[PDB]
Amino acid sequence: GGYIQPFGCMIAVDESSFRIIGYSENAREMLGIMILAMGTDVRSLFTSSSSILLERAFVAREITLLNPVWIHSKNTGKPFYAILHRIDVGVVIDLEPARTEDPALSIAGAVQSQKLAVRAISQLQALPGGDIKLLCDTVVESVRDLTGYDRVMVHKFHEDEHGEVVAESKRDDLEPYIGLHYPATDIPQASRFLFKQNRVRMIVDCNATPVLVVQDDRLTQSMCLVGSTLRAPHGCHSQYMANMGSIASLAMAVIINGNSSMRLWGLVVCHHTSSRCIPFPLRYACEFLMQAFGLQLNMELQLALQMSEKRVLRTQTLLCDMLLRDSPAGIVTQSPSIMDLVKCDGAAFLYHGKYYPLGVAPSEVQIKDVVEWLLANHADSTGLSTDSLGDAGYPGAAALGDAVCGMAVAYITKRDFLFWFRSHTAKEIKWGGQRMHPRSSFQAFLEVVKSRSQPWETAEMDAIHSLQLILRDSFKES
Amino acid sequence: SMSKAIQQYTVDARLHAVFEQSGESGKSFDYSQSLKTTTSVPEQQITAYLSRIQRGGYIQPFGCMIAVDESSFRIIGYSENAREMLGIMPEILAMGTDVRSLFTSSSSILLERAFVAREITLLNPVWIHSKNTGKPFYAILHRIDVGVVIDLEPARTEDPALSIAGAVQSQKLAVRAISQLQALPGGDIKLLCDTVVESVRDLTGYDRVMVHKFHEDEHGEVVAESKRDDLEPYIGLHYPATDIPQASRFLFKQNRVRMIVDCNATPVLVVQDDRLTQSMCLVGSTLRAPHGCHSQYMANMGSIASLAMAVIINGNSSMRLWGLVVCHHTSSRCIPFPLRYACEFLMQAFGLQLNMELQLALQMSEKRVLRTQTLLCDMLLRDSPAGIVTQSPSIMDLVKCDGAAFLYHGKYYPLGVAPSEVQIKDVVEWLLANHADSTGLSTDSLGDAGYPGAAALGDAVCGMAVAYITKRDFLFWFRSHTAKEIKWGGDGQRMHPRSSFQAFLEVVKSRSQPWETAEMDAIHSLQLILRDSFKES
Amino acid sequence: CRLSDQEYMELVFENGQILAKGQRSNQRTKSIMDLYEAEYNEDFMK
Ligand SMILES: C=CC1=C(C)/C(=C/C2=NC(=C\c3[nH]c(/C=C4\NC(=O)[C@H](C)[C@H]4CC)c(C)c3CCC(=O)O)/C(CCC(=O)O)=C2C)NC1=O
Ligand SMILES: C=CC1=C(C)/C(=C/C2=NC(=C\c3[nH]c(/C=C4\NC(=O)[C@H](C)[C@H]4CC)c(C)c3CCC(=O)O)/C(CCC(=O)O)=C2C)NC1=O
């Protein structure tokens, strides 16, 4: 069936006739019974007003827009927040105890959730719209202040779905984690799908015994507890958190629109040294704040993309104007050069035998070996670009070492070559700080990405192709 | 001083004084005549205007106000209807008493906890019950220079679970509205405004929701509207800037929302203590009664209840009021408390999206201008100088205009709407006579510039911009009057939107849209390029 | 960098210029969760 954390109840009821089909082993005890048994009426377990509220929630075609529901117990009268969701078989209710039994304070907290969220968003909006690091720092500071956890950080997901910490805020007693990288394997695709569907996931503690779910024998499809927020953590990740030292977790997703359908940009995770069950209003305040976070981050991303395109066009036209005057060999002889048009560590140009280095470039013998390779293998192509000389078929790959690993080439006719090098992804990562652990994850990431550079982005393709076409026209005129 | 608000403050004070003078003598306030009369105001007039606007001693008759001191919870002011509202009337409500003796003991403890506080308190508002009849009240606490002011509003008496359900339903509606706003194709503003208007109308439930946009002249315009079928349209309206006193704009920038339950009810006076120097400051209370001018405006127009919310973007930190979204009804309407916060959340999202779209549009416009400039440079290099105006793209594409011309050793090339040869000779003679030592000239209107021939030119062209290519060759840009593209489907004694539109058409008569700085710098760039090219030859 | 609360201001005309003078001229040293725990204490219900 499944397992749930030992701080809430699980009850599954029929949509048509409010007939219970499944219940958690923890429901019969904390709710107030000792009756529940099997095949009874859910409304009989609460008061009349709570029954009316539940019936109204069931009638509504959207299960959402009515959560949470403030219902009361029958045998003891204590409150229980309820969250509803459909599983295409029945209706599932999750009950979590409430610590505020005073009716007067309940509405006060409900309104204060909205007030805190709008105050945090108003604080967020005041920042200038020109960078992303300040945005993430402000967001993590605000979330840490609101939640009062022990460590708050932002994870960013790259093209290869491998994470990276870009912001951090912690009590000055633990080692920092800013700058760490980990492989994409640590995040299965199921977790990404769940985050894209339900934008929250919290863990009270990892040392508690999970509670089995009791199922009915009239069904064969088991139960789809994907939508549940009370599901127990997996064994692997619970062990991971156990070795890490963090016992409580709270992960919320940052979502962008992208080519429309949504895209998971990253996560905001929190860690605590001991168990922490935060009250509901603060949870909703954080949930509301992250929507504005996503909006602003999308705006920043689009603005940065436009500025990058503009700067690329400007440097390309400056290079064109340089090439127009006197010989085309003067491209490499002035400060605005090939290296300034694309993020790279090295570039080169071959022209009538003479070879002009730029940045981290290999010796002329290695250049001519690369050229004879290219004529041997790919002669009818117009360009080539790979992130690793190794694994691409180079027998002389070890000669370069960890300095000329990246690759990008655009031919002129058959002999003149425009060159772009890139080093391995180990000189931009510092991270000064068998058993599953972040250190082992970092070492595994270093091992897997070894002898490889960062992937070339599409905008680099358009830039090099435009420059190449302009160059071809320049020699065609002559 | 050069700012429009600084000049507008004196005009607003003069208009308020004229309205008060007309009212005290029992006449009818003439709108158009008063607007035309004024275009030199002592300190006393401005001081009286501000004091009357902020400290009026009048509240709306749907909520009582009680102000006490922070020291010993001693009452230092209240409203007349407070005695009746609490069920106090059969001294127990007298100045100098203890505010904790009017509510239940638990409510008193909660109020005391909310009083002794810090920069931020976590009980605002509080849910309290009256001592006598147990009526629930939404108590909003804010601090003034002499004490703490408590605004009390009636609350629907029902099960608390129903109140929680209503609050969460409103918040979920706001969240769904934001989510629907997110899933939109970018690059346009009108669609965003229409979606926001429709979502707000669905959320609140008023009879008409409108979006007002403030231009650089500080006047307004409606771009989006959701009527109730039989109501007369108001989209495309333009009204003079003086319809919005700067104090109202500052208040809207201070508190995001402002509601008027009913304009036909009698405002309630507020008593005070003799020891206090000046009247109570009603700038932070949501129960402040509107002034007579706006009440008369809404009564004449037809709206009975109103609700206006502000759209604030980031300007280059600094907050800039882009405009307002307003709601109008035809009866009494008082929305509950949480809906106001949900609306504020929606307005925050709308402002963020508006800032993105504005920045994206600015960048796209700059890119298009640069592309046009390099294309025109290519045409200039390829062919004779006179060819830049012959084949498209041409000078028109550089800036938003309705016509342009080029003079080149006595050769005149007309394009679009433009004066004939004789009028260009007259205008160049005027320029060389008056503006000799200048690299450019931008005029919003030729009549105000001082052109004797402006009247004979007509409404075809009224605004112009000139770049001095040489001492004898000049480049002209022409624009028509503002009223050409102003179109709305619709004796200025009474205060009506028609009178506002007529006054706006009167003031902007024989005037064009202002030449923005972006167009000016693009013109300067092209002028520099042309000067360099012609100096090369 | 604190959440704080909205503070209201009043317009006054002094020295021939518009100024928005503040209304009132021990900072918080605890997280909002601690404030929530301390203030929302229903001990006096007994
Ligand atoms: C500092 C390092 C760090 C890492 C590497 C990290 C990984 C991570 N791993 C995550 C999730 C999972 N990661 C896994 C699986 C594994 N994690 C590993 O390290 C293994 C490759 C694998 C188990 C064999 C599972 C099953 C989950 C879902 C857990 C559940 O929802 O019950 C998440 C999402 C949110 C959360 O932490 O609860 C994160 C952020 N979180 C961290 O803080
Ligand atoms: C379609 C026409 C239209 C107009 C011209 C219009 C003007 C307007 N006038 C507005 C406000 C005010 N306008 C005034 C003053 C005046 N209005 C005029 O027409 C007079 C020139 C002047 C009377 C002193 C005042 C004092 C207010 C603030 C009232 C208060 O809140 O106590 C507002 C914002 C507040 C609201 O709408 O509740 C608006 C939007 N609203 C409309 O719908």
- Kindly write down the DSSP assignment for every residue of A71-119, as one continuous string: EEBSSS--EEEEEEEE-SSSEEEEEEE-S---HHHHHHHHHHHHHHHHH
Q: Concatenate the DSSP letters of all residues of A167-218 into one string.
A: EEEE-TTS---TT-EE-GGGS-HHHHHHHHHS--EEES-SSSPPEEEE--TT
Using CB distances shorter than 6 Å, the residues near ligand 1 are: A 177, 182, 185-188, 191, 201, 233-234, 236-237, 240, 249, 251, 267, 269, 438, 441
CA distance B99 to B497: 46
Instruction: Give the dihedral of Cα atoms A290, A293, A298, A301; nearest 10 deg.
Output: -130
Helices (H) and strands (E) in chain C, counts: 1, 2
Instruction: Find the radius of gyration of the CA atoms of chain B.
Output: 29
CATH class of B182-260+303-371: alpha beta
CA distance C44 to B104: 13
Nearest bound ligand to the CA of residue B23: 2
Name the B residues in 170-199 with CB < 8 Å from any A CB: 171-173, 175-176, 178-179, 182-183, 186
The dihedral built from the CA positions of residue A318, A323, A326 and A329, taken in this order, carries a sign that is: positive
Q: Closest to C10 (Cβ–Cβ): which among B123, B124, B281?
A: B281
Q: Is the Cβ–Cβ distance between A73 and A101 less than 8 Å?
A: no
Instruction: Count the residues in chain B.
Output: 537
CATH number of A99-205+247-304: 3.30.450.40
Q: Is the Cβ–Cβ distance between B226 and B208 less than 8 Å?
A: yes
CA of residue A173 to ligand 1 center, whole Å: 24
CA distance A474 to A376: 27
**How distant is the alpha carbon of residue B478 from its chain centre?**
30
Its CATH architecture, for the domain B383-536, is: 2-Layer Sandwich (3.30)
CA distance B147 to B93: 18
Residue position matching structure tokens 């009212």: B23
In C18-41, which positions are buried (b, 16+ CB within 10 angstroms) versus exposed (e)? beeeebeeeebeeebbebbeebbe
Q: Is the Cβ–Cβ distance between A205 and A275 less than 8 Å?
A: yes
Q: Helix B160-182 and helix A48-59: axis angle, to 10°?
A: 20
Chains with ≥3 CB–CB distances under 8 Å to B: A, C
Range of the domain at C9: 1-25
Residue position matching structure tokens 């990276």: A164
Name the helix (H) or strand (E) containing A311.
helix A280-324
CA distance A368 to A381: 18
Name the helix (H) or strand (E) containing B527.
helix B517-536
CA distance B367 to B353: 21
Q: How was this structure determined?
A: cryo-EM
**How distant is the alpha carbon of residue B149 from its chain centre?**
28
Which chain C residues are closer than 8 Å to B123 by Cβ? 39
CATH class of A326-477: alpha beta
Using most ligand atoms within 8 A of CB, pick from B37, B243, B301 the residue to mutate for ligand 2.
B243
Name the helix (H) or strand (E) containing A31.
none
CA distance B315 to B358: 11
Which chain B residues are closer than 8 Å to C2 by Cβ? 119-120
Q: Is the Cβ–Cβ distance between A1 and A232 less than 8 Å?
A: no
Domain range summary for chain B, segments of one domain joined by +: 4-54, 182-260+303-371, 383-536
Whether C16 is in a domain gets the answer yes
Nearest bound ligand to the CA of residue A188: 1
CA distance B359 to A300: 10
Q: Is the Cβ–Cβ distance between A243 and A251 less than 8 Å?
A: no
Q: Between chains, do B356 and A64 touch, taking CB under 8 Å as contact?
A: no
CA of residue B47 to ligand 2 center, whole Å: 21
Strands A406-411 and A383-386: antiparallel
What total of structural domains would you count in chain C? 1
Residue type, B297: Y
Best of B46, B49, B111, B340 to disrupt the C interface (most C CBs within 10 Å) is B46
CA distance B102 to B87: 10
Residue B276: count other Cβ atoms within 10 Å of its Cβ: 12
| B306 CA: nearest ligand 2 atom | 38
Distances (CA, A) of B136 to B61, B111, B155, C45: 17, 14, 5, 19
Token pair of A170 as six digits: 């912690």
Best of A112, A124, A142, A145 to disrupt the C interface (most C CBs within 10 Å) is A145
Whether C46 is in a domain gets the answer no
Q: Which of A114, A229, A100 is nearest to B166 (CA)?
A: A114
Q: Is the Cβ–Cβ distance between B53 and B39 less than 8 Å?
A: no
